[PDB]
């Protein structure tokens, strides 16, 4: 069965695992490493995607456009620090 499903995740554990070794970050990366990282990635994705989705509704739309990601990221004080030196194209 799928490593992504075994870990109860959406993000590709396998892919993340490939990237960790290909990347030449480590000599050998452990088993839980990609599953933890994949997990954090999915989390953050859900987070900003949530706030973004809210801003999309608040205006009047159903599709989330960059403006929403922007408005979303900048309004959450915590997310604004993380993506502080990040420029959202068309944001």
């Amino acid at each position: 069965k799928s490593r992504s499903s075994r870990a109860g995740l959406q993000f590709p554990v396998g892919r993340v695992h490939r990237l960790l070794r290909k990347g030449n970050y480590a000599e050998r990366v452990g088993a839980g490493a990609p599953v933890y990282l994949a997990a954090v990635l999915e989390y953050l994705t859900a987070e900003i995607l949530e706030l973004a989705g809210n801003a999309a509704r608040d205006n009047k739309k159903t599709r989330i456009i960059p403006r929403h990601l922007q408005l979303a990221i900048r309004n959450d004080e915590e997310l604004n620090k993380l993506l502080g030196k990040v420029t959202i194209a068309q944001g």
């Binding site: 109860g8 452990g30 490493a33 997990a39 994705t45």
Partner: protein, 90 residues
């Protein structure tokens, strides 16, 4: 590149709100970015502690270091929850 997953996550959070291709572009940039960031610190942590392998214990400390205050606490919880399921869920 992540579009599949980010869309999958989207429906999970807002099962009625779509996302533009251009906005999807951004999401993909975000995913690759913080991946690069976290793996960078993780890798840095391993060399400092003269370990040849990147454990999940490095991903965690990396997460504590790079992510803000309370935003980091969840990420650790989620990762531990996730790692533990996978390990037990053989």
């Amino acid at each position: 590149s992540y579009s599949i997953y980010v869309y999958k996550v989207l429906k999970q959070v807002h099962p009625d709100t779509g996302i533009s291709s251009k906005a999807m572009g951004i999401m993909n940039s975000f995913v690759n970015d913080i991946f690069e960031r976290i793996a960078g610190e993780a890798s840095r942590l391993a060399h400092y502690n003269k370990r040849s392998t990147i454990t999940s214990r490095e991903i965690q400390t990396a997460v504590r270091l790079l992510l803000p205050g309370e935003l980091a606490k969840h990420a650790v919880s989620e990762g531990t929850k996730a790692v533990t399921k996978y390990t037990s869920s053989k």
